[PDB]
Amino acid sequence: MSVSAFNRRWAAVILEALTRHGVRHICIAPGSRSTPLTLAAAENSAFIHHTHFDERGLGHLALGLAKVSKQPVAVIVTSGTAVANLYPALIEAGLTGEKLILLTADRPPELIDCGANQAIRQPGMFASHPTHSISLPRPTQDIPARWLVSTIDHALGTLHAGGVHINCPFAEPLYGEMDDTGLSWQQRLGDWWQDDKPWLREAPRLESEKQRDWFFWRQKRGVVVAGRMSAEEGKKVALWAQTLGWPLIGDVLSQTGQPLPCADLWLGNAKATSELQQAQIVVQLGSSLTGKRLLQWQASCEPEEYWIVDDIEGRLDPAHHRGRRLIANIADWLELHPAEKRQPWCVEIPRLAEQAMQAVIARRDAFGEAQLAHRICDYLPEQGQLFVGNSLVVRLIDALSQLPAGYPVYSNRGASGIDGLLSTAAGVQRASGKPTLAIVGDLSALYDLNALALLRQVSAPLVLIVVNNNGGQIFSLLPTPQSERERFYLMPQNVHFEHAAAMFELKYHRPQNWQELETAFADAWRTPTTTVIEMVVNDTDGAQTLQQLLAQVSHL
Amino acid sequence: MSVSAFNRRWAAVILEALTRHGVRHICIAPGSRSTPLTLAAAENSAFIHHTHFDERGLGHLALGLAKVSKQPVAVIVTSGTAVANLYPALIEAGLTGEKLILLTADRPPELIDCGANQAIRQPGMFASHPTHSISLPRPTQDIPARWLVSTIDHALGTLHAGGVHINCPFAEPLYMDDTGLSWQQRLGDWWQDDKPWLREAPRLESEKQRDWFFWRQKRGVVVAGRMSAEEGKKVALWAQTLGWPLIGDVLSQTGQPLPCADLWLGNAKATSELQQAQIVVQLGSSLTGKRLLQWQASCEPEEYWIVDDIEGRLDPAHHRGRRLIANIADWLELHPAEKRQPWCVEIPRLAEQAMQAVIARRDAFGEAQLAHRICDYLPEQGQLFVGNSLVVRLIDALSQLPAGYPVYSNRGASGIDGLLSTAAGVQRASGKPTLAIVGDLSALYDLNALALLRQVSAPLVLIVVNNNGGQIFSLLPTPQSERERFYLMPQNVHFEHAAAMFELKYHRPQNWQELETAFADAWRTPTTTVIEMVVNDTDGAQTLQQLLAQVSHL
Ligand SMILES: Cc1ncc(C[n+]2csc(CCOP(=O)(O)OP(=O)(O)O)c2C)c(N)n1
Ligand SMILES: Cc1ncc(C[n+]2csc(CCOP(=O)(O)OP(=O)(O)O)c2C)c(N)n1
Numbered sequence A: 001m002s003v004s005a006f007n008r009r010w011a012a013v014i015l016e017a018l019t020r021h022g023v024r025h026i027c028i029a030p031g032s033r034s035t036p037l038t039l040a041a042a043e044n045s046a047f048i049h050h051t052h053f054d055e056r057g058l059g060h061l062a063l064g065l066a067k068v069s070k071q072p073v074a075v076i077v078t079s080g081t082a083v084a085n086l087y088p089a090l091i092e093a094g095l096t097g098e099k100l101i102l103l104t105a106d107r108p109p110e111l112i113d114c115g116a117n118q119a120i121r122q123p124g125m126f127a128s129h130p131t132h133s134i135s136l137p138r139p140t141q142d143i144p145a146r147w148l149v150s151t152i153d154h155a156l157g158t159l160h161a162g163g164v165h166i167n168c169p170f171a172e173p174l175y176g177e178m179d180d181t182g183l184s185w186q187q188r189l190g191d192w193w194q195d196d197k198p199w200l201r202e203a204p205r206l207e208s209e210k211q212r213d214w215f216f217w218r219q220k221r222g223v224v225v226a227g228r229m230s231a232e233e234g235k236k237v238a239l240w241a242q243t244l245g246w247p248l249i250g251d252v253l254s255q256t257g258q259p260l261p262c263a264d265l266w267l268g269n270a271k272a273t274s275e276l277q278q279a280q281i282v283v284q285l286g287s288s289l290t291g292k293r294l295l296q297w298q299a300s301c302e303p304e305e306y307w308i309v310d311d312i313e314g315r316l317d318p319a320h321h322r323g324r325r326l327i328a329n330i331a332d333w334l335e336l337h338p339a340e341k342r343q344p345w346c347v348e349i350p351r352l353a354e355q356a357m358q359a360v361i362a363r364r365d366a367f368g369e370a371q372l373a374h375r376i377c378d379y380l381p382e383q384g385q386l387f388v389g390n391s392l393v394v395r396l397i398d399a400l401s402q403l404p405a406g407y408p409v410y411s412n413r414g415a416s417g418i419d420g421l422l423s424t425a426a427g428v429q430r431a432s433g434k435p436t437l438a439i440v441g442d443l444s445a446l447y448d449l450n451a452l453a454l455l456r457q458v459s460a461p462l463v464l465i466v467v468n469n470n471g472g473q474i475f476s477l478l479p480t481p482q483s484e485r486e487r488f489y490l491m492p493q494n495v496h497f498e499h500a501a502a503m504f505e506l507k508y509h510r511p512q513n514w515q516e517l518e519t520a521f522a523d524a525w526r527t528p529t530t531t532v533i534e535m536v537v538n539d540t541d542g543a544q545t546l547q548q549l550l551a552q553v554s555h556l
Numbered sequence B: 001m002s003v004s005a006f007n008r009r010w011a012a013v014i015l016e017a018l019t020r021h022g023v024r025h026i027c028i029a030p031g032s033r034s035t036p037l038t039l040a041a042a043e044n045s046a047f048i049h050h051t052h053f054d055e056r057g058l059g060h061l062a063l064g065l066a067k068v069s070k071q072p073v074a075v076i077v078t079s080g081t082a083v084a085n086l087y088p089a090l091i092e093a094g095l096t097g098e099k100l101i102l103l104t105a106d107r108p109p110e111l112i113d114c115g116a117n118q119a120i121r122q123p124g125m126f127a128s129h130p131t132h133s134i135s136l137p138r139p140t141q142d143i144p145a146r147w148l149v150s151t152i153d154h155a156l157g158t159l160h161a162g163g164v165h166i167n168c169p170f171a172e173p174l175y176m177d178d179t180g181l182s183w184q185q186r187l188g189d190w191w192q193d194d195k196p197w198l199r200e201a202p203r204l205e206s207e208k209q210r211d212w213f214f215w216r217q218k219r220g221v222v223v224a225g226r227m228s229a230e231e232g233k234k235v236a237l238w239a240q241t242l243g244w245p246l247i248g249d250v251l252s253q254t255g256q257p258l259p260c261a262d263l264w265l266g267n268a269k270a271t272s273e274l275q276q277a278q279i280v281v282q283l284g285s286s287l288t289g290k291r292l293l294q295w296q297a298s299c300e301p302e303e304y305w306i307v308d309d310i311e312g313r314l315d316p317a318h319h320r321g322r323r324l325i326a327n328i329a330d331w332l333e334l335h336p337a338e339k340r341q342p343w344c345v346e347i348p349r350l351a352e353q354a355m356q357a358v359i360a361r362r363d364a365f366g367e368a369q370l371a372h373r374i375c376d377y378l379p380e381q382g383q384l385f386v387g388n389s390l391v392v393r394l395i396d397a398l399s400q401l402p403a404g405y406p407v408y409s410n411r412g413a414s415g416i417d418g419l420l421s422t423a424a425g426v427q428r429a430s431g432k433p434t435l436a437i438v439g440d441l442s443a444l445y446d447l448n449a450l451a452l453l454r455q456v457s458a459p460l461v462l463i464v465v466n467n468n469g470g471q472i473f474s475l476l477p478t479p480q481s482e483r484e485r486f487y488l489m490p491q492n493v494h495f496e497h498a499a500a501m502f503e504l505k506y507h508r509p510q511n512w513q514e515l516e517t518a519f520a521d522a523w524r525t526p527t528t529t530v531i532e533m534v535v536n537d538t539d540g541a542q543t544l545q546q547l548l549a550q551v552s553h554l
């Protein structure tokens, strides 16, 4: 009988299946072909529903939700280039861990490759990027519901990390009276409908094993490198490293309090690198290192062994040292391999890190972006959240600032895309319900400008800083050629964000000094709304301040 | 010795190569990894260079440029999600033919699957979507320049239609010696030449149909889909000669001698008279209107033919018939019309009556009336760019565009995600005064492409119809309780600040007289003007349904 109603039972089974794997959040874009999924989502009370009109944005929103909640988040799009728009976030998820569940509506087999409207080849479209790909058959009562749910349960239970693409063909008639056409079809699942378990539970844990020679390795001259990890882990890492007596190089992404701050500077001094040559083991916890100096030192250092511990699969060392690649939750790992008290071995790096910070403090007064990067700890909301954007900002904070241990930092530093930052910020705040400082460059805000539509709906204050240095000035930092520099690298767009804010009825400030920035913040934090704070600066000031400080610190 | 230099030498061969296959335009997005490619492209005065910060918009800009010039258009992006942002445009290319050449930078093989920054798996990212995909190896002088250029020449020379993915890995130092020189000079006078190194240029064509003189005396229908504007004119004369009724889509440029087909095709007396068609000849594809697609699906002529310069099946109802691959103008010459007498006498009445049913409603200030009135606004010697959702459908159903008036669109996949950047492409390509029309969500999706509309060579009027949400979901029989939140998604916004941000003239007319003025002024400078038509949310869909019914009864 009714195809429009069976379409829905079929959809209804998919969505309800996801509930049993901790999918609370679901992101939905508009369309027709997606009707069965979207109706099923709307009916399902177990969901918190988020919507957006830009499918790349929706993709990053879902990324932000998952990045924070550490749950899997579902997405629903109709067919066509809507599906293609998930690719960026999907790629990002694939590198950093977010469990993104992409339910992509499709045309049925009959309407593919025959010049039907809005009909592309969907299955296999994201190549190896998703962790699991499921390519569903034309819907039919001749396939038991037990097959449908099992297929989902398998993909969701074995998901360690990364995306899942679940392609969903539906034949038209999409709309009609909801008959009771697949009701007994669904009832073959019995009291599963009233359960909270999966239909099929398939949930192996993947974990490296206790390193049984650790007692010898922990007593060697070692260096701790802290990359991306959770707030709590950052504190754990710092106490552990200190116990061991090893120098901790901690990234902005790390939340360890960076007890040797300005590593991107001091790592530039030869006295620092001589000392580090003595290290026999490096233990890196987390990955996605930020700073240039760190990436170099890490690429050139020659310890006996190099260990990377993180809870995502695959090689994480881009310089391919002899060593170990250890899959584990970082907190469990610290516990499974406790530190033992040893007398610190580094005499000269601790003094160098203080001299480096001193040198930065000396230059804190100018109203530039490197200074803003430096001061950023003074502007973090209490009980709040920092989301840090790509390009200069993340580098500057990493180089010029010492962020507090355990203070939550968020980012897209997998593929480092400047394409999703605002919509990602939105999902980040909606996930925790926390006050949010997001900081982003001018090209970046333009790139995801329409995500300001999302930012009209936040549950706690959000402050979006837009550092506007008229272009991508990262490329003033890099030794790019002066002749095509401007039109082909910087691409200034000669724009401001007063109107952007006005369009989405968001508060706006363009502060011209430290007192006006603080006033702006003070106003901002008062309401559960987004405030745009554009900081206008001389385009090359930030990039030069870094080069100068780099050279200065390298002399000490 | 120097890697930097050889990286540049290697990229210059790639880019020079492309000069030889008709590539004039190259669109570039910013990046460091792309340095080799971008510098080589900067140097080469054979290209017009276009830039943009949004890689998805840059893809559709290219798409726009290609759509109109009918040349291949090159693209450069850096590694990472930049590349992934090209996917929507490639896919649209793959469907409708634009030749997009995607030079996408990559890190070297040593740097993949090892947690390097901005390093993803790039070869095959786009699956079956490009027509060719070259995955270049790591640059080395051990592969001679000849191999590199041959590979490109094969890909381009044999390219009938669609995108080419060229993944170009580069190891770094990225930032010049004589390193790659003698290695380049192995190409001899090819550097001062005009032609590919290897020419591989097979023609792909369907043979003349030897039974044409038999069929052309039968009861035929002619269906005109997307084609060139000149082709629209020739198809018009052709069907007119034959005495066959011409159903011409908005994209056809036929002059639609039987307009409002989406309306009159719901009249039983029209279906009845078409039920006598022994042959249907369709030229072009991507037909717009619902009723047309239904009439197609259900008709049973002895033969259904589709003529178009793209490959693959094009008939979604899968009739017994022929799929003929040809330039349409060439195909009309080859299968010339016999001056017979019109065999349809009632359809001409209904098409006339349905258009009257429309003018009886032309007065309100609504989107359905704008769609209908739209030729009064067409720039002289200009070109129309029609966006998606309601606009294309209402214009196809209620208007009569003139024969030969160039119409452009994205009706392959029908994405609402690249309409503004595509339109900018359309304008830059032809240098013509342009009218582009777009929904409110559409304008929101590609909002940042207004940066692109600050550099236009002639007046561009951008009409944003704002009915507050995707109102096509009030046309479609969607469940009323979920429709606002889960289909319609009103964003409760206007475009005044959007325009002003990018330094573009703006109007929000509240009547026909105000609109006229805005238009009249707008055409007097080489700049983009934004015109926002605010209309009651559901009036367009409502109007159209009521016109369907009305026509359906008479
Ligand atoms: C989607 C994407 N495209 C391109 C890049 C290359 N890219 C890296 S930084 C940058 C500049 C962005 O400029 P902005 O956001 O204004 O900040 P700034 O460099 O001035 O700090 C670009 C284009 C990228 N990382 N991601
Ligand atoms: C990239 C993309 N995502 C989703 C769709 C599905 N879709 C088709 S029409 C439409 C509504 C667009 O609204 P406006 O652009 O506001 O159109 P209108 O009011 O005429 O419906 C949508 C979301 C699409 N065609 N392309």
Ligand SMILES: [Mn+2]
Residues within 6 Å of the ligand: A441, A442, A443, A467, A468, A469, A470, A471, A472, A473
């Ligand atoms: Mn910038």
Ligand SMILES: [Mn+2]
Residues within 6 Å of the ligand: B439, B440, B441, B465, B466, B467, B468, B469, B470, B471
């Ligand atoms: Mn709309």
